[PDB]
Amino acid sequence: APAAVDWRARGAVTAVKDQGQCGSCWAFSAIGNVECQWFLAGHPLTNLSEQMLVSCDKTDSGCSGGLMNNAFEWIVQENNGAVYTEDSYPYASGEGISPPCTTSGHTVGATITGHVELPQDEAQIAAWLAVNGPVAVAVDASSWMTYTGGVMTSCVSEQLDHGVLLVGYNDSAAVPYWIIKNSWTTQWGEEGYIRIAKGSNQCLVKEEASSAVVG
Numbered sequence: 204a205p206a207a208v209d210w211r212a213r214g215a216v217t218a219v220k221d222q223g224q225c226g227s228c229w230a231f232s233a234i235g236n237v238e239c240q241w242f243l244a245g246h247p248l249t250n251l252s253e254q255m256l257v258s259c260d261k262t263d264s265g266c267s268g269g270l271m272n273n274a275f276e277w278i279v280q281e282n283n284g285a286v287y288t289e290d291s292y293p294y295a296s297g298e299g300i301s302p303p304c305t306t307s308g309h310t311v312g313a314t315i316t317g318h319v320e321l322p323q324d325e326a327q328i329a330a331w332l333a334v335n336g337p338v339a340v341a342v343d344a345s346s347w348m349t350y351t352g353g354v355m356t357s358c359v360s361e362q363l364d365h366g367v368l369l370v371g372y373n374d375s376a377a378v379p380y381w382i383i384k385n386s387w388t389t390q391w392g393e394e395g396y397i398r399i400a401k402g403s404n405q406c407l408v409k410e411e412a413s414s415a416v417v418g
């Protein structure tokens with residue numbers, strides 16, 4: 204696989220978002236993956252709805268958390284493969300209450316037929332992403348309140364608890380790194396992003412990586 208990949212540079216990544224006072228990381232990770240996999244299947248880049256998943260997906264638990272894998276399945280199985288647009292189902296859980304599910308008066312912005320779950324291997328994950336696009340991953344983020352920039356290298360880690368999006372990597376660098384999109388606004392980290400060290404399972408980045416498939 205190439206030396207460096209960065210799907211923002213190829214127009215595949217929408218702007219950084221804000222989950223607010225809601226534990227919906229898993230929804231933003233899932234959606235940001237779709238947003239990008241959609242685009243890379245010949246469609247134009249559209250902002251899609253997290254609020255759809257927080258409110259309507261009952262396999263997960265809205266602002267008290269969930270996993271990306273369940274979010275992909277609910278889209279497919281329960282919601283007929285559809286993902287509404289952010290515009291026709293805007294995000295409304297920033298104050299901390301997820302308001303109730305509404306099943307109509309929206310607009311479908313994208314569609315999926317399923318998802319793959321990548322093996323627990325950084326290099327295979329890297330290889331895949333080089334070709335197929337961004338990858339939703341689980342990580343330990345117990346200690347990211349502190350993160351101001353640079354390439355996180357220490358990240359000792361006891362469990363998975365945050366969802367985010369791999370959008371790239373760079374193996375030339377003295378410290379090789381992943382490029383990860385987060386949903387805590389452009390204030391946090393490097394304009395909303397974080398680099399973590401690639402090749403030592405930093406923050407448990409390999410452990411629960413997956414992605415949607417647009418048919």
Ligand SMILES: *[C@H](CC(=O)N1C(=O)C=C(OC)[C@@H]1Cc1ccc(-c2ccccc2)cc1)[C@H](CCc1ccccc1)NC(=O)[C@H](CC(C)C)NC(=O)[C@H](CC(C)C)NC(=O)[C@H](C(C)C)N(C)C
Pocket residue numbers: 225226227228229264266267268269270271340341342344345346347348363364365366
């Ligand atoms: C999103 C993650 C999140 O937003 N944050 C972090 O993980 C770290 C952050 O800031 C530094 C942000 C905000 C944050 C900060 C601090 C806490 C905290 C602090 C002290 C004690 C408790 C909590 C929480 C969040 C969400 C957060 C879910 C959440 C919301 C409120 C309270 C606790 C947890 N994370 C998830 O949705 C994850 C994402 C997966 C991809 C790993 N999912 C989970 O955490 C599981 C969701 C299930 C399906 C409910 N959790 C579990 O499985 C656990 C384990 C121990 C079995 N269950 C609930 C017991």
